[PDB]
Amino acid sequence: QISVRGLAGVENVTELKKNFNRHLHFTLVKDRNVATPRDYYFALAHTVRDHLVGRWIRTQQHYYEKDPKRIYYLSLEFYMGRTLQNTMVNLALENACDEATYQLGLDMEELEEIEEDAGLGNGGLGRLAACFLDSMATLGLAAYGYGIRYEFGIFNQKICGGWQMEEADDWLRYGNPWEKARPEFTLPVHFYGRVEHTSQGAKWVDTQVVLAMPYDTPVPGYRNNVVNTMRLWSAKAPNDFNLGYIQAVLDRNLAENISRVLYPNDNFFEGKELRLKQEYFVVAATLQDIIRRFKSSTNFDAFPDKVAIQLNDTHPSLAIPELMRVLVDLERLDWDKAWEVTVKTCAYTNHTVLPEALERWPVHLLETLLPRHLQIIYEINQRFLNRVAAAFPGDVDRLRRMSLVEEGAVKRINMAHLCIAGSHAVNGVARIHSEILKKTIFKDFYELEPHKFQNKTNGITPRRWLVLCNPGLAEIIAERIGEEYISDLDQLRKLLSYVDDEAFIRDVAKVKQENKLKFAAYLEREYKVHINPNSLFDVQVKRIHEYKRQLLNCLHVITLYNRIKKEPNKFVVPRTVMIGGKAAPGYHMAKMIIKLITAIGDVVNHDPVVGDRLRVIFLENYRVSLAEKVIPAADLSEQISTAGTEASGTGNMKFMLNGALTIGTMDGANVEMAEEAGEENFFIFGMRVEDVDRLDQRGYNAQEYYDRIPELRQIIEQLSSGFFSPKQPDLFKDIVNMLMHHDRFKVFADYEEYVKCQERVSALYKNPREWTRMVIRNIATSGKFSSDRTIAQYAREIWGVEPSRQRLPA
Amino acid sequence: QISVRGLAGVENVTELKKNFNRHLHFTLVKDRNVATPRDYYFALAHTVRDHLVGRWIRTQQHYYEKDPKRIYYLSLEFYMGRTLQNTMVNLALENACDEATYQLGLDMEELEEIEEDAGLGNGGLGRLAACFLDSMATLGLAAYGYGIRYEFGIFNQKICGGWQMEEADDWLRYGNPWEKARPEFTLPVHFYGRVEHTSQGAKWVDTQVVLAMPYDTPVPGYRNNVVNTMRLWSAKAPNDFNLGYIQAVLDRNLAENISRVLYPNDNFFEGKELRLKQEYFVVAATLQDIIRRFKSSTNFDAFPDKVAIQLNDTHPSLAIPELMRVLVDLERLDWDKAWEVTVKTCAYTNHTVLPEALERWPVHLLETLLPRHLQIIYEINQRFLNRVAAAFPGDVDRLRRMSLVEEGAVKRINMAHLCIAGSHAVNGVARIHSEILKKTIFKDFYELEPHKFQNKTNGITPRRWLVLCNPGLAEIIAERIGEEYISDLDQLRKLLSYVDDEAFIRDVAKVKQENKLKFAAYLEREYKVHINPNSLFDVQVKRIHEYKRQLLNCLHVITLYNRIKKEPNKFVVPRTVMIGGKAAPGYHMAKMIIKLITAIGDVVNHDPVVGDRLRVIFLENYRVSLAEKVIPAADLSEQISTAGTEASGTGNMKFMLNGALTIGTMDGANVEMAEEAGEENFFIFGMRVEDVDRLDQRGYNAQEYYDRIPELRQIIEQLSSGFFSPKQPDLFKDIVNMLMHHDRFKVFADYEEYVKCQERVSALYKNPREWTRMVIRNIATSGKFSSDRTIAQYAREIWGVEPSRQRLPA
Ligand SMILES: OC[C@H]1O[C@@H](n2nnc(-c3ccccc3)n2)[C@H](O)[C@@H](O)[C@@H]1O
Ligand SMILES: OC[C@H]1O[C@@H](n2nnc(-c3ccccc3)n2)[C@H](O)[C@@H](O)[C@@H]1O
Ligand SMILES: *Cc1c(COP(=O)(O)O)cnc(C)c1O
Ligand SMILES: *Cc1c(COP(=O)(O)O)cnc(C)c1O
C-alpha cells in the first residue's frame, strides 16, 4: 500500500503464506476451522521470527570473528512494548506480511492488537533502554541489553469509581514467541554468608545459591541485517534447595520471587530487600557472562579495551564492587590494578535530581545480604576520601558531603557517590540537567574530577515513534525527501523548504485529521466514550507525579469550565483534554490526582451548557502500545514539570516528531527542543530554574497567589466545598491542603502564565494554516532527538567505539 | 538394522534429516558448531513430534464427526517416562530416525538418554495409567487421560553414606516438547466459600477461584494412526488475586502451589489439605471439560451413553459429588435423575486393601474446603443407608460398617464407600485381590449389590515393555512368528512349539547375555561399580515397602554370605543381587531398609573370601527409564510380598515378558502368571492367603522362628551386635525390634521356604539349557498380561464400547 513499508514480491508473499500455514498446523496444532484470532497472531509471530534467526546467528558469529569492543547496557527496566510490527518494520516485511495475511482473509492490524506489551519498565527510563537497544542495533554496535525477565511487568490499570485499581500484568500467560530460553548458560548467584580472611585473601563462604537462567530476545537493527541480543535473567532454585519434603519443594518460591515482579515506582526509592536482591541478581549473573565472553578471545589490562559497562542509573551500581570482588578475590589482581580496570570499564548515567529517587541503602541490609561487597565499598570510600583530603586539605565538610557512607540514625551507602567514584564517565540526560548536576548535587565530585562529567541528551527511535506508529506521516515525508531520514533523522530539516508548499501543508493536516478520526473510533470501540474529532486534542500522558503537575493541567481545565459557565454563549476553541498515566500503588497523592481528573470529567462531560466544547478523558492503562495510538493523534503536548525537576523527558520528543505543538516549561529537553525549532514555534511559559531558586530563597507562599487571583480562588473554593465530589464534600481536602501549605512544585506560581499561554494556543488553533506551518517547523527540527544521535555520542565520547550504517550480508 | 524397528526409506531418511536441520536452526537457534548433545535431542524430538500432529488433528476431528462414547481416565498419577523412543516405535520411525541421525554423524541412543522421565507417579498405579493410555490408543478408543501437570514429579533419589537423599525432580527445566499449552481452555475451580439456600435451590458463594490451565500431550496408538490426548491441568492465580501490591503478586504462589508437587507416598494415605486441593482441582476442571464436550453434539439422560468416567482409586472420588453438584445445583435436574446419571457414568478401580492406604478424609477439612460437596455426601449417605436398612432390616451393625461417615474422635468420610455407592462397577486388579474385596473389606457392599463387583487383572503394554526396551528379544520372536504379536500378545503361545528348537534356545540365551553385558557396562560407566556378567542377576525393583519384603531378600543375601564364610572352598552359583526402589521421604522404616541393603553391600562386596561369587548392588533412582534397562537384563524376578498384600503387581509381568524366571508368593497376579505358565515353570514358595489367616487366628510369634532356625538366629545376632554397622553398633535396632515384635508381614514365617526355593533356582541355573527352556515357557504364556487384554475387558464389561484394530487414514 505505502512505500516505506517495503515491497510485497510474489515470491516473498507466497513463502510467508506457506510458512504461516506450516506454523498454524505444526507449531500451534490448530486447523483453520478452530483457530482464534490469537492463534493467527501466533502463526504470524512465528513466521516473522523465522526471518530473524539467520541474521541473529550470523551477527553473533560475526562478533566472535571480529572480536569488537562489546557494550553492556545494564538496566532493571526495558520497556519494550510489542515486538511484531517493530520486527516487520526493521526487516522491510510489513507490506509482504500485510499482503500474505490479506490473501488468507485476515487483517494484520487486528492480529497486531492481540500482542501483549512487554511492560518490563515504569516509564521514561525503561523506554530509553528500549530506544537505545534499537539505535545500538541500527548503528552496528556489538551491544547487549542485560536485565531481569520479570514474570509480572508494570501493573494493568483499571479505573473503578474514578479510582486506580491494580491488576497483575500476566504477560507470559500465552507464551512469548520472541524469547529463547538458554537453560544451558545458567549461572549461580550468591547471597548472605560471611567473609573469612585467609593467607590467600578474603573468601565469601556459607552463601545461599540462586540460579540465574538467561532468556535471549533478538533486537533487529533498521534494515542493516544486524540482530543484537537482549538477555534477561530468571531466578531458579537449585535442586538440593531446602533439601519436610513437600514444604521444601514449595519453599523454592522464596528464591524464585527475585524475578517475579517489577517494582512499580517511577522517580521513587523504596529500600526493600527484595529490590536489593533484584539489583545484585542481575549484576552478578551479567558480570560472570561478560567475563566468560572476554576469556574466549589471564590479562585484564585489555578488559576495558574489550568491555564497556553502562549503568542505567544506580539500580546496577553493585556492578562496581562486584567487578572489584571478582578481580581481587577470584582473579587475584592487586587492588589498584583491579580498580583501574573497573573505572575504565564502568560509566554512569544519572536520570534525576529528585532527592526521594536517589538510592541510599541502609548498611545493615548490605551487611546481611552482601557482606563482602560492603567491605569493598568501605575500602573504596577510604581510598576515595584520601584523594579528596589531598586535593582539598582541611576541608572536613567536603569529606562528609562526598563520603559514600552517610552518617545518621541509620548509616546508608549513597549509591550515586559509588557510581561517580567507580566510573570514568558520568552523564545527565539533557543539557540543563547535566548543568544542574555540576552546580548542585555533584558540584563537589565535579570540582575533584571535572573530566568525568558529560551531557548525553536523550532521544527516541524514529522507527517505533514515527514509521511504526504514524505510517501516513512517514509516507508524505518520504514522498518529498525519500526514506534515508529514518536512519538519519537530521534529514527532516529538508522539510523547512516545504513550509510554504500548499500541498504539503494540506497533507500534514490531513494525516493529523486521519490519526484523530482513527483514535476517536478506538476510544468509542474499546471504552464506549463519544468525543468530537474536530476539537483540539490536548494530551498529557506520563506517569502520575506531583513534579509533572497534572494538577496544573486540572486547574486550566476547571478554569475553561468556569469561563464557559460565566459566558455560555461565547465562542471558545473546542478541546478534548486527555490525561493518562499510572500512579505507583503506594503513592497516595498520585492516586488522589487520578480521582480528581475523573471527578472533573464527571462534572464537565455531563454539563449540557458545555456541549462538546470541553471534554475531559482519563486514558486508562497508559503504556507503550497506547502511546503509539494517542501520540500521533495529539495536537498539543503538555510538558509542564516545574523547572529543574524533569531531567529530560522523552514523551516531549515523541510528540514533536508526530505533529503536535508543545506547551511547556523551560525544563529538561524542552529547552533543546525550543532551541532547535525556535522559541516562536513553541508555547513556553512559567518560571525558569533561576526563578524557582529566587522563590525558594524568599519562601513559597501559595496564599499570595490564592489572595491575588480571583479565578484561582474560585477553583480552590469549588474543590474544598465538594463541587467536584457532592457525595463526599471533603474528598479532595488532601489536595487543597497540599496546594495551599506543602507544594514542593509551586503549581500556583505557574498558574497565571499557563492560562495566558493556553489562550495563545487556542488563538493559533483558529488559524489551521498557521498552526500547520508551525507544526512543520517542529517536525523539521526534531532530528536531534533521535536515539541514533544519542547512541553515536555515547559510543564516540564514552565507549570508544565507532558506529557504522553498513549492512551485514543477509 | 532389525525388522520390527520398520523401514528406512531413502525419501523418509532425506526428509527426517532436512527437518532435523530446520529445527536445529529455526527452533533451537543453534548452528552445528555450538550445538550440545541436548540441542540434538531437542531437534530430533521436534522432528518426531512433527509426524504426530497431522494424526492428532485428524483423530480429534474424527471423534467430533463419529461422536463415539468417550472414556475419561481420571488419575492423580501418570507415570509416562520418556516419550521419544515410544513415539518412534508407534509411528514405525525408529530405523528411519536411526539412519537419518547416523548420517548426520550422531548416535540416536546417546540422544535418547538426554530425555527426562515424565515421573508424574509413584510406581505401579501411575505406570498402569500410562500402559492403559497406550492400550486405549492402540484399540482405537476415544479416550482421554486427565490429571495434574505437577511442576515436580517423583523426587530424584541420591544415596549418601548408604542413606536416601531426596532432590527435586525439575523435569521441565529445559522445556517439554511433547506438551501443547492450551491457555484458551482455562477453567475456574472454586474452594472455600459457604452454601446459601434460596427458593431456587442451594448456591455455593464467596468462593476462592483458582484457574486450571490444560496442557495436552499426544498418546499415539501402535501403527494405527490414532493419537489420543492426555490433558494435564496447571494451577494459575486469577489476575485480580489478592488485588500491599508486591506481596499480593508474590502471594499468587499460594494458589499455584496446588499443581507444584506430586505427593511421593506409595500405598499410604497422608490427610493433608494440599492433597485434597489437588484431588478437587483435577476433578472440577475435568468435569467442566467433559460436560462442555458433551453439550457440543438440555438432555442428560444420554450422558452415560456418551461418557464413561473411570476413577483410578479414590484419589478422584470427588468426581461423584461434583457431578451431582453440577447436575443438581447448576443444571437443575432432580436428585434421583442426577444420581442415576452419576452411577451409570462412574466406575471405580480399587488398587489395595492395606488399611493405611485407604483415603478417610476428616469432615472438618471437607467442611471448610468443599462445604457443598460435604452436604451432597451426607445426602448420598442418608439415601444409601435407607436402601441398606430396607434390604437388611434390623442389622444396625451393617448400617455403621457401610456408612460413608465413620464415627470417632474425628469424623471421616470413607471415600472407597463413596465410590461403591456412586459407581455402577467396582473392580480389583487381579483375581485373588477381587476375591479378597468380596470376602473382606467390601463383603457388605457385595451382598447388597453383587452385580457391581468385577475383576480386571492388570497388564503392561508390550510396546514399551518388549519392543522398546528389549529389541533383540522382540526380533528373534518376530523372526519365527512375525510381528502381529506386538498388538495381539496371545500370539506368543506359538513359541511353545520352539521349546525344543536348538537355534531358538541359543538365541533366547544370547539375547539375555547381550542385555546383561550392556547393563553391566551401564553400571560401570554411570556409577563406577564392577560386576561379573556370568552371575545370576537376582533383581528386586519396586517401591521400598514393608509389605514387599525387601527385608526377606536381605535375609536370603546374609544367609548366602554366612554359608560362603562357613565353607569358603565350596562351589555356589554366583549371583549379582540388585535391589532398587524409592522410599517415601517420611517412611522411617523404608529409609532404614535402604540403609541396611547398602550396609550389607559394604560388607559382602569387600570380603576377599567371597570373590565375585556374591555382589549386592543398590540401584539408585529406580524409575521407568532404569526399569527399561534392568528388566531386560534380569534372570530372577523377586515378587515376594506376603500373601494378600500385593493387589496385583505389574513389575512381575514386565519380567515374565523379558525372559526372567519368577521367585514369588501366591500373591496378586503371581497367581495368574503361575496358572498361565504352569506351577512347574515358576518358583512358588511360602504361606498362601489361607495360611496367613491361620497364623493371625492363633497369633504371630516371631520368637518361635528365631528359636527354631539357627541360620536365622545367626543373622539377627549379626544385625543386633553391629556386624553390618561397626561404627554404630545399634544402628539397626529398629529393624531387629520390628522383626521380633511388630512384623505385620510375617518375614520370618516365609524365611525357611524362601531359602530352600532359592536353592532350587541356583540348581536350575547350573543347567543353562533347562533354565532357557523354562524361560521360553514363561515368555510364551505372558500374553494374558498385555494391557490390550485388560483394556478390551474394561471396554466390553464396564464402558460399553467395542475396541477396534482398524487404522485411521494417515
Ligand atoms: O532519562 C530517562 C528518563 O528518566 C526518568 N527517570 N529518572 N529516574 C527514574 C526512575 C528512578 C527510579 C525508578 C524508576 C525510574 N526515571 C526521568 O524522570 C526523565 O526526566 C528522563 O527522561
Ligand atoms: O494396580 C496398580 C498397582 O497399584 C498399587 N497401588 N495400590 N495403591 C497405590 C497407591 C495408593 C496411594 C497413593 C499412591 C499409590 N498403588 C498396588 O500396590 C499394586 O499391587 C498394583 O499393581
Ligand atoms: C515515552 C514514554 C514515557 C515517558 O514520558 P515522559 O513524558 O518523558 O514522562 C512513559 N511511558 C510510556 C509508555 C512512554 O512511551
Ligand atoms: C512397573 C513399575 C513399578 C511397579 O512395580 P511393582 O513390582 O508391581 O511394585 C514401579 N516403578 C516403576 C518405575 C515401574 O516401571
UniProtKB/Swiss-Prot annotation, chains A, B:
Name of a matching Pfam family: Phosphorylase
Cofactor(s) this protein cannot do without: pyridoxal 5'-phosphate
Phosphoserine PTM sites in chain numbering: 3, 403, 487, 720-721
PROSITE patterns: PHOSPHORYLASE (PS00102)
Sites of N6-(pyridoxal phosphate)lysine modification: 654
GO cellular component labels: skeletal muscle myofibril
Molecular function as annotated in GO: glycogen phosphorylase activity; nucleotide binding; pyridoxal phosphate binding
Marked site (Involved in the association of subunits) residue numbers: 97, 131
Site feature (Can be labeled by an AMP analog) residues: 144
Post-translational modification: Phosphorylation of Ser-3 converts phosphorylase B (unphosphorylated) to phosphorylase A.
One GO term of the biological process aspect: glycogen catabolic process
Keywords, sorted A to Z: Acetylation, Allosteric enzyme, Carbohydrate metabolism, Glycogen metabolism, Glycosyltransferase, Nucleotide-binding, Phosphoprotein, Pyridoxal phosphate, Transferase
InterPro entries for the chain: Glycg_phsphrylas, Glyco_trans_35, Pyridoxal_P_attach_site
EC number: 2.4.1.1
Keyword RNA-binding attributed: no
Activity regulation, short description: Allosterically regulated through the non-covalent binding of metabolites, being activated by AMP and inhibited by ATP, ADP, and glucose-6-phosphate. The activity is also controlled by post-translational modifications including phosphorylation.
Record bears the keyword Cell cycle: no
Residues annotated as binding AMP: 31, 64, 292-297
Phosphotyrosine modification, residue list: 192, 215, 446
Substrates-to-products reaction catalysed: [(1->4)-alpha-D-glucosyl](n) + phosphate = [(1->4)-alpha-D-glucosyl](n-1) + alpha-D-glucose 1-phosphate
Homology family: Belongs to the glycogen phosphorylase family.
NCBIfam families reported in the protein's UniProt record: P_ylase
Subunit structure: Homodimer. Homotetramer; to form the enzymatically active phosphorylase A.
Protein's job: Allosteric enzyme that catalyzes the rate-limiting step in glycogen catabolism, the phosphorolytic cleavage of glycogen to produce glucose-1-phosphate, and plays a central role in maintaining cellular and organismal glucose homeostasis.
Protein name as it appears in the record: Glycogen phosphorylase, muscle form
Native source organism of the sequence: Oryctolagus cuniculus (Rabbit)
